[PDB]
Amino acid sequence: GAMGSMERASLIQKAKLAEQAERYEDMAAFMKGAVEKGEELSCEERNLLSVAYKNVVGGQRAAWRVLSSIEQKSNEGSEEGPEVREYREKVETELQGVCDTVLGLLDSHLIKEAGDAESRVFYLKMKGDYYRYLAEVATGDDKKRIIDSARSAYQEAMDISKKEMPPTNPIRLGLALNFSVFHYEIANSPEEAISLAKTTFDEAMADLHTLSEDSYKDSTLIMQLLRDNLTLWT
């Protein structure tokens, strides 16, 4: 624990500073240290955690995709060495390491100690996301098992959110958006992805009349992402 000597409050403060500076690797390390203090995260602190690793792994994924595309071309009239595979493997292993770290945090001990529905679904969404990222690069005997670990995490979160949260809750909507992307491009189930995105969107639309103005900006943003995926998918 490189962050073991720093106060929890200082770690949170420095995670927010890193966010303002778009230093997401630092931000993730500070929030990892904060989690390892053993206390549960607040609503605001959970968002710092997810944003940090989302951006770290997001850049790794985009780079992995660039390299995997170059690798695919190299294996088509293409001239031969091992360098492209080697560097793709380097980025891939670094990506898997970050996913393993996030999943370990969720397992020790954020998920088990989360009692309120909002936090439980939040962390189960994260668990599904980072197993999905592992599935994006998986090609061996583990792909099928990795895919089902994502499905199982996403599904439990779905069951909780449909029981404990209103249709317009931003965490419930974000979970549904990502579970539908899982169906579409991981689980080879585009019809399930389309059905979920549409029922999710429609039921949030019919519930907007209950919300106060300018207090569901995040829910609106996610409803637009659902509409964009549907436009692309249909």
Partner: peptide
């Protein structure tokens, strides 16, 4: 590209 959050 598929959009996630």
């Amino acid at each position: 590209v598929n959009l996630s959050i």
